[PDB]
RNA sequence: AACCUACUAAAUAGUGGUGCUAGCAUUUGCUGGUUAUCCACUUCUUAGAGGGACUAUCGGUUUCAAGCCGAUGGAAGUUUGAGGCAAUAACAGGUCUGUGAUGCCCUUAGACGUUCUGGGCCGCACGCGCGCUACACUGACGGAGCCAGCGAGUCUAACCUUGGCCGAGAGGUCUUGGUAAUCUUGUGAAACUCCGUCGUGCUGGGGAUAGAGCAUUGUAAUUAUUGCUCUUCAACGAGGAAUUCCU
């Protein structure tokens, strides 16, 4: 222990950025939107914000024993001192990152760039949305370089609702 | 074992590195977070820094 | 009336201090006198030669009893100037340990000043003795 | 001060130490247009002499003049700080020097010689007539030599 | 922080901040109290410390 | 004058100048009127003031140069030369020793010789450079009060800078001179030369 | 530039359009009409609309 | 206790607080008398309140003064302001009115502004210069 | 070197009889008269004040300002 | 960033009373010491919640419109001053030398992998750019006064460092507070103010170059990391054509 506040709460920011990092790279064919972490006495918690919590929990009770293990192993918990919880998430038509990955496994599962950029602006707006945009930068087939958009409804894109209204 | 594949590695940009990338150059070393301009721009906001002023 | 020494003008008090301090003889200085700078960041050791280790004195006397307690370093930080590194940008630097911690000690010999608790030198009571007395000294020769 | 009236007691320049010495000149300063003689020295010299500062080169009894030149080139007997000399450790004998005069070019030399004798890398370079002390020569120093 | 990665162009500058913010309460009570209103009033983000001692 | 005391004293003269007259430094604002028509309202005296030093802000607004103690602007105007850009208090103490110097020498308000020599030089017009067709003639015009009192200052100011520059006198000496050799138009000032040269050029290609 | 936007002197607009009793020539009564009257979510632009409101009564 | 009050003065970052109660009659500044102070130049600059509103307001009460922060013209603009709002205060708190408005009449009719804090403050240097407006320099080629 | 470094006994006696009609007597004053320097210039402006001629109504460092007896 | 003697408070912020106490005057007083000897308070400080400005009040100008101008008021009236954010499209601007971001190409064991030794990016006839120090007397020099705010600081370690001695200095050594509004630290910074010395002379302005010595970081200082002491005492006497920045 023993640590200054400021390297404190700086460190727990990297904390969670390595974590959700982490959970990105290994929960993405499901889905998986977020983390958040609850500190305890007794216990340190962790909440698994995805949209597949039958594959992330695994036959009788793995994976998420995996996962935990994993993640004890690295930051060095004693066994018992972190929980590992997921959770579905509310309609995922609002998550930025779970559509993004949805994309991205649209074209990975081979889909014609319309129809994948449309169809998810589609879904999100029938979400209950004020607005939805798709940036599609990159080359497909063609040699030269191109770029899409694709919005659709109301969104702003200056000042505090930034920090507000709009998931990026 | 093999006395030949080390040498002094305790200060200077060589000893460290980058959390995330390995990268000793740029690195942002304070508060004792240790990750580099180039990767704490793109995790800023998911440790805690963000932009106000 | 009633005297103190912050009820007399900075410059004419230590300027008496100095006189009092010449005219009572007794001192301590350490020997180094004349020979020596002062400061780092200094370039000519002071013109007063035979001297000024009474003005430094008084001047460490005066601004001791104005507050709690301070030590050597201190003194040398209010003691600095400015260092003229040449072609280079000035920067203040800390003045001599030795000077400051001999005119302390050379004090607290003639019983001006005491080691205090906590740290530091602290105002001793013949200090504000014999400095509230000067000043009313000063202030007589005004009157 | 105080206002003096002297007679022709003082005469203007004065000879020592193979130098020429402007009087009628505070000779704190006076002193520094020797070889080897800077305001320090000079002035702790000066202090050591037991004369006055207030007076000019131009007084200064015969007296005091041979104080002077005395006090100078023997440091260490006069009691002077051994750091306050110049030329500390020699380099053969080992003695506190303080070259003075004449004196220090003819030692920049002994010094120098006495590198490219060796031949070690601060001799080549003031043998190739360039910068030793390590800085940099790609833009500064054209007129130079 | 520079805002470019390389080096190339106007230098623009960012400042990035971060706000801590401490605040401490003292409170006189016996060990039932205060274990009853520790372990509960949790909440993920607020760090939560209890000293004691005079000393 | 009715003296009074209470605890912490207050000195003879000190009591004696500042509860009755209000006048400067120890300098009298009673009297002195601007010599010339014009330049009033911009040249000061009154309301008076003790040290030419004031956190006025003369410069957020267009004319708000024009209120402010003309004393005072010759100080401000003092401090630049680079170098002492700012400090303030070196030109104001100079000032002072300006104003002695100017008061020991033929008597006179040495405020009111200042103001004889900043209503002496502002000249009455000038030349500006209108095109004409490439070749830019020179055109006479009427220059306003405040460019008047603005040019006499910095006039004034510079030649004494470099009077004052690498010679035996100092700031205060070399400026009062100025300001008494530009009391009434001398031609031996460096001030009374450009304003008559101004108005020579400007009556030239008329 | 103190012109004061397009939803300023909307929003003015419509509040002299349908409430000409209530309202007078004061800025604080109008400002805490505005308050009970209307949904402006902030102080600057609720007092910017009261300061317009202001002056299109007072002239009207 | 004695009928007393308290003041500040602020300028640029130097804040002045100044105690004003029934006494004597002594104007004392962090512990050395108003006949100090120096700047010296200064000097008029805080004696300045004293002179505007006349000596002898100051025989019923004690006027102590301390100063930190900000520099020296910065803390000499402080304890003025601080000494004047003070007079002002008193005379609000304690005596009358009209006494009150008379004083604040005869201050800000000269003043310097000895009752207003002035709002001036630095602004912050933006990058691509050695200031806030003072940019860099450039050579295009 | 050019000059006034010195005392030369005629010229103190010039200093005793050359300032009347000097309502401005000062450093840059005494060398303007062709003569001493700025050192031994302010031992006069010391010394004449020892008694009569000098009047002090200045001050300090670098500026000096005398006026003649009354 | 400015405004709150209105609101909740705070021995990690501070104020007044009070004892314990030092000093000067004595006739009450003045000026200090006292992390708990108590009692009160929050004007100063601190961040919580609110309030406050809407270019208002009056008057000018303008198609009596938007607006602008002037005065009074005001903490503040140039978008209140400063920034954060920031649409649509554009460049073949820069970045595969930030990335375990990547397509294809190249190499892959005598490596273009990687590590170890030493050198090198600093090399110097010259050209171009950002600069730093200066040519001095609104000054150097030496005493003396002595005044800020933005930060940062040591765990499975050696960070910020008070203080006490030693040393001219650089420094060393003996101890300590502090994971911090608590300790460093009021960061006693510097120009600046004051009393002097010098006195217009490449002068005591200037400090390049250069020698000799002591020190610190570090496994290592040579082509000199830096730091200090003595001595050496260059160009530069205000800068041509041009040209940067600023309300
Ligand atoms: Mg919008
Ligand atoms: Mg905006
Ligand atoms: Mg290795
Ligand atoms: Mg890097
Ligand atoms: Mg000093
Ligand atoms: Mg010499
Ligand atoms: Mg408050
Ligand atoms: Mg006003
Ligand atoms: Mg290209
Ligand atoms: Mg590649
Ligand atoms: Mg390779
Ligand atoms: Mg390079
Ligand atoms: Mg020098
Ligand atoms: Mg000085
Ligand atoms: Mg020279």
Redesign the pocket.
């Known amino acids: 222990?023993?640590?200054?506040?400021?390297?404190?709460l700086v460190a727990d920011g990297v904390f969670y950025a390595e974590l959700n990092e982490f959970f990105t790279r290994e929960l993405a064919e499901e889905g998986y939107s977020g983390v958040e972490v609850r500190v305890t006495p007794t216990k340190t918690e962790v909440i698994i914000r995805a949209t597949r919590t039958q594959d992330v929990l695994g036959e009788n009770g793995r994976r998420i024993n995996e996962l935990t293990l994993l993640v004890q192993k690295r930051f060095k918990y004693a066994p018992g001192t972190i929980v590992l919880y997921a959770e579905r998430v509310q309609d995922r038509g609002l998550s930025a990152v779970a559509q993004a990955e949805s994309m991205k496994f649209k074209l990975l599962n081979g889909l014609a760039i319309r129809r994948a950029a449309y169809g998810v602006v589609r879904y999100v707006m029938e979400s209950g949305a004020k607005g939805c945009?798709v940036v599609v930068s990159g080359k497909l087939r063609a040699?030269?370089?191109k770029?899409m958009?694709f919005?659709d409804g109301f969104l702003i894109?200056?000042?505090?609702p930034?920090?507000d209204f709009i998931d990026t | 074992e093999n006395v030949?594949?080390?040498?002094?590695?305790?200060?200077?940009k060589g000893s460290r590195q980058?959390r995330?990338?390995?990268?000793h150059?740029?690195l942002i070393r304070?508060?004792?977070l240790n990750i580099?301009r180039?990767?704490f721009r793109?995790k800023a906001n998911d440790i805690g820094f963000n932009?106000?002023? | 009336?009633?005297?103190?020494?912050?009820?007399v003008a900075?410059?004419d008090f230590?300027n008496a201090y100095a006189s009092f301090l010449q005219r009572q003889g007794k001192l301590e200085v350490?020997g180094?006198v004349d020979?020596?700078?002062?400061?780092?960041?200094?370039?000519?050791?002071?013109?007063?030669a035979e001297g000024?280790f009474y003005?430094?004195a008084?001047?460490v006397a005066?601004?001791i009893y104005?507050?709690?307690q301070?030590?050597?370093?201190?003194?040398?930080?209010?003691?600095?100037?400015?260092?003229?590194?040449?072609?280079?940008?000035?920067?203040?630097?800390?003045?001599?340990?030795?000077?400051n911690?001999?005119v302390?000690?050379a004090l607290?010999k003639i019983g001006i000043v005491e080691?205090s608790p906590?740290?530091?030198?602290?105002?001793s009571?013949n200090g504000?003795?014999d400095?509230?007395?000067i000043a009313?000294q000063t202030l007589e020769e005004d009157e | 001060?105080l206002v003096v009236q002297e007679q022709g007691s003082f005469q203007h320049i004065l000879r020592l130490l193979n130098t020429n010495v402007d009087g009628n000149?505070?000779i704190?300063?006076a002193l520094?247009?020797?070889?080897?003689?800077?305001?320090?020295?000079?002035n702790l010299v000066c202090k050591k002499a037991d004369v006055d500062l207030?007076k000019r080169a131009g007084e200064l009894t015969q007296e005091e003049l041979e104080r002077i030149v005395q006090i100078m080139q023997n440091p260490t007997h006069y009691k002077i700080?051994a750091?306050?000399?110049?030329?500390?450790?020699?380099?053969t004998d080992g003695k506190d020097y303080?070259?003075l005069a004449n004196n220090?070019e003819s030692?920049?030399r002994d010094?120098?010689e006495?590198?490219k004798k060796i031949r070690?890398?601060?001799g080549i370079?003031?043998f190739?007539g360039?910068?030793?002390?390590?800085?940099?020569?790609?833009?500064?120093?054209?007129?130079?030599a | 922080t520079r805002k470019?990665?390389?080096?190339?162009?106007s230098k623009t500058w960012?400042?990035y901040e971060m706000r801590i913010?401490?605040r401490?309460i003292?409170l006189e009570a016996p060990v039932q109290i205060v274990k009853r209103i520790t372990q509960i009033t949790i909440e993920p983000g607020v760090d939560v410390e209890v000293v004691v001692a005079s000393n | 004058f009715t003296p009074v005391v209470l605890?912490t004293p207050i000195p003879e003269e000190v009591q004696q100048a500042q509860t009755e007259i209000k006048l400067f430094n120890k300098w009298s604002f009673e009297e002195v009127e601007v010599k010339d028509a014009s330049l009033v309202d911009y040249v000061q005296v009154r309301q008076p003031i003790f040290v030419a030093h004031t956190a006025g802000?003369y410069?957020?607004?267009?004319?708000?140069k024009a209120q402010c103690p003309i004393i005072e602007r010759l100080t401000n105007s003092?401090?630049?030369?680079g170098?002492?850009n700012?400090?303030k208090?070196?030109?104001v103490?100079?000032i002072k020793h300006t104003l002695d110097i100017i008061n020991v020498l033929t008597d006179q308000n040495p405020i009111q010789v200042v103001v004889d020599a900043i209503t002496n030089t502002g000249p009455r017009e000038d030349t500006t450079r209108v095109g004409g067709g490439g070749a830019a003639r020179r055109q006479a015009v009427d220059v306003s009060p405040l460019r008047r009192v603005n040019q006499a200052i910095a006039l004034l100011?510079i030649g004494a800078?470099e009077a004052?520059?690498?010679?035996?006198?100092?700031?205060?000496e070399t400026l009062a001179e100025e300001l008494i050799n530009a009391a009434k138009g001398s031609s031996t000032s460096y001030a009374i030369k450009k304003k008559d040269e101004l108005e020579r050029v400007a009556k030239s290609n008329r | 530039?103190?012109?004061?936007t397009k939803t300023?002197?909307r929003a003015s607009k419509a509040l002299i359009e349908r409430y000409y009793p209530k309202l007078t020539?004061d800025?604080?009564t109008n400002?805490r009409l505005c308050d009970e009257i209307a949904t402006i979510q902030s102080?600057?632009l609720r007092?910017?609309?009261?300061?317009?409101t202001?002056?299109?009564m007072?002239?009207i | 206790?004695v009928p007393?009050?308290?003041?500040?003065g602020?300028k640029?970052?130097?804040?002045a607080?100044a105690?004003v109660?029934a006494?004597?009659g002594?104007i004392?500044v962090?512990?050395?008398p108003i006949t100090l102070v120096?700047?010296?130049?200064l000097r008029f600059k805080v004696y300045e309140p004293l002179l505007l509103v006349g000596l002898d307001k100051f025989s019923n009460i004690?006027i102590?003064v301390?100063?930190?922060?900000?520099?020296?013209v910065?803390?000499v603009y402080a304890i003025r302001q601080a000494i004047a709002?003070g007079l002002v205060?008193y005379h609000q708190k304690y005596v009358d009115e009209q006494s009150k408005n008379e004083l604040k009449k005869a201050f800000?009719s000269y003043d310097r502004t000895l009752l207003?804090?002035?709002?001036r403050?630095?602004?912050?240097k933006?990058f691509g210069?050695?200031?806030?407006?003072?940019?860099?320099?450039?050579?295009?080629? | 070197?050019?000059h006034?470094?010195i005392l030369d006994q005629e010229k103190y006696d010039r200093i005793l009889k050359e300032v009347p009609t000097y309502r401005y007597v000062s450093?840059?004053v005494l060398?303007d008269r062709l003569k001493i320097?700025?050192?031994?210039?302010?031992?006069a402006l010391?010394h004449l004040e020892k008694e009569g001629i000098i009047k002090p109504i200045s001050?300090?460092?670098?500026q000096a300002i005398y006026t003649r007896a009354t």
């Open positions: 222990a023993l640590i200054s506040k400021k390297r404190k945009e040699a030269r370089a770029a958009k919005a894109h200056s000042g505090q930034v920090n | 030949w594949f080390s040498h002094p590695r305790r200060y200077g980058c995330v990338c390995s990268s150059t740029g304070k508060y004792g580099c180039q990767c793109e932009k106000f002023r | 009336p009633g005297v103190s020494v912050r009820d900075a410059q230590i350490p180094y020979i020596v700078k002062t400061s780092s960041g200094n370039e000519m050791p002071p013109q007063d000024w003005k430094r008084a001047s005066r601004h104005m507050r709690k301070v030590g050597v370093g201190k003194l040398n930080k209010l003691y600095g100037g400015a260092k003229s590194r040449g072609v280079r940008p000035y920067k203040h630097i800390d003045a001599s340990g030795s000077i911690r001999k302390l000690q607290e080691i906590k740290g530091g030198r602290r105002i009571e504000q003795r400095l509230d007395r009313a | 001060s000149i505070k704190v300063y520094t247009t020797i070889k080897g003689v800077g305001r320090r020295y000079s207030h700080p750091w306050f000399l110049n030329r500390q450790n020699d380099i303080h070259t220090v030692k920049l010094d120098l006495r590198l070690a890398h601060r370079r003031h190739w360039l910068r030793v002390r390590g800085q940099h020569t790609k833009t500064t120093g054209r007129r130079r | 470019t990665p390389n080096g190339e162009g960012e400042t913010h401490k401490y003292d | 605890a802000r410069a957020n607004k267009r004319f708000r003092l401090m630049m030369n170098r002492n700012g400090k208090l070196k030109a103490r100079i100011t800078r004052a520059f690498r010679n035996i006198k100092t700031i205060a | 530039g103190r012109v004061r300023v002197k020539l800025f604080q400002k102080k600057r007092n910017k609309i009261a300061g317009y202001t002056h299109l007072k002239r | 206790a007393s009050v308290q003041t500040f602020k640029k970052s130097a804040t607080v105690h109660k006494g004597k002594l004392k962090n512990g050395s120096e700047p010296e130049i004690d102590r301390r100063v930190t922060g900000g520099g020296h910065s803390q709002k205060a800000t207003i804090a002035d709002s403050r630095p602004e912050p933006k210069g050695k200031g806030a407006r003072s940019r860099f320099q450039k050579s295009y080629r | 070197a050019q006034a470094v450093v840059s060398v320097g700025g050192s031994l210039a302010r031992i010391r001050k300090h460092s670098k």
